């Protein structure tokens, strides 16, 4: 594999199965593969929060949005987005814009691990041999596998909502 070894033992059904049934990674360089993972984790981390946000909003808990609209917004998260006051949406975009600015320009993640937006690499070990720790690779699997599931899950929610209610 050579370059895909930098993201090795971190995907597939079982943790050490480089899936890629399209050749999207072969012939690509090490930095490109790392950047591809940075896109994957960022999508998945947002997808995990997106699914959680979808469920806490599709059950009837839209306080900020019921207290701002002065009426219980519809449970359907897609329809509740329209009812949500335009001031709320613009502030929501701005807050994420500040976070995206903050991570990129002032506090950039490293170039070898472009997904360390919190930056554990300066205090983490990741290469020791203890059992009651050094399971960081396993928790990387749980983040990726859960996030990948959340990505297809949230799309299913949006596609079904926008079509078959």
């Amino acid at each position: 594999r050579e370059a895909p070894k930098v993201l090795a033992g971190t995907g597939g059904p079982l943790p050490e199965s480089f899936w890629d049934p399209a050749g999207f990674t072969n012939n690509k360089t090490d930095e490109e593969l790392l950047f591809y993972r940075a896109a994957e984790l960022k999508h998945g981390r947002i997808a995990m929060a997106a699914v959680v946000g979808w469920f806490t909003n599709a059950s009837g808990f839209h306080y900020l949005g019921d207290l701002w609209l002065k009426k219980p917004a519809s449970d359907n998260p897609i329809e509740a987005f329209n009812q949500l006051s335009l001031l709320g949406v613009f502030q929501m975009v701005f807050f994420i814009g500040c976070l995206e600015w903050l991570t990129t320009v002032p506090c950039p993640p490293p170039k070898d691990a472009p997904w360390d937006v919190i930056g554990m690499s300066d205090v983490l070990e990741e290469d020791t041999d203890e059992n009651p720790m050094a399971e960081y690779k396993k928790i990387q699997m749980q983040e990726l596998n859960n996030s990948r599931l959340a990505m297809v899950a949230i799309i299913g929610l949006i596609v079904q909502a926008t079509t078959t209610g």
Binding site: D20, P21, A22
Partner: protein, 153 residues
């Protein structure tokens, strides 16, 4: 080698290489498998009837209400054929041709060839591809029959 047959040679009046033939071989075997599944698959809603039944999504106790060779739909089993389409993709993305080192070898999960009866190479590999070619024409000819010449039988 492999699918070279007996009644004809390389039958290439048009690939004719190594790497390009390998990809074409994967297409050939793949199309062969589906036709054989489809050909025997089409004869079964015939004699032995539209065998199905049991509690299905919007098709509970559906006796395979998708009739005719095309299957039609109208929320009858053919909508459930999309589940066949989806799960067909799962096998097409897990046990696929990108890690399929030979032409169309899936590592023989069933191990039918581990002396259960099939054999490696020789006639069996040639018999699989030759039978696939016959079924592909048969399935296409069966498609013409349902369209403008009545039904299958």
């Amino acid at each position: 080698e492999l699918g070279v047959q007996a009644p004809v040679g390389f039958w290439d009046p048009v690939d004719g290489n190594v790497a390009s033939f390998r990809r074409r071989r994967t297409v050939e075997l793949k199309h062969g498998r589906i036709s054989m599944l489809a050909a025997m698959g089409y004869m079964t809603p015939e004699i032995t009837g539209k065998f199905p039944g049991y509690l299905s999504p919007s098709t509970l106790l559906k006796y395979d209400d998708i009739p005719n060779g095309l299957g039609a739909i109208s929320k009858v089993p053919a909508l459930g054929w999309a589940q066949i389409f989806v799960y067909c993709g799962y096998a097409e993305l897990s046990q696929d041709q990108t890690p399929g080192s030979p032409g169309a070898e899936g590592n023989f999960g069933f191990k039918v060839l581990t002396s259960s009866d099939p054999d490696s190479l020789e006639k069996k590999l040639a018999s699989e591809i030759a039978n696939g070619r016959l079924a592909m024409m048969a399935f296409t000819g069966m498609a013409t029959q349902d369209g403008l010449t009545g039904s299958a039988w």
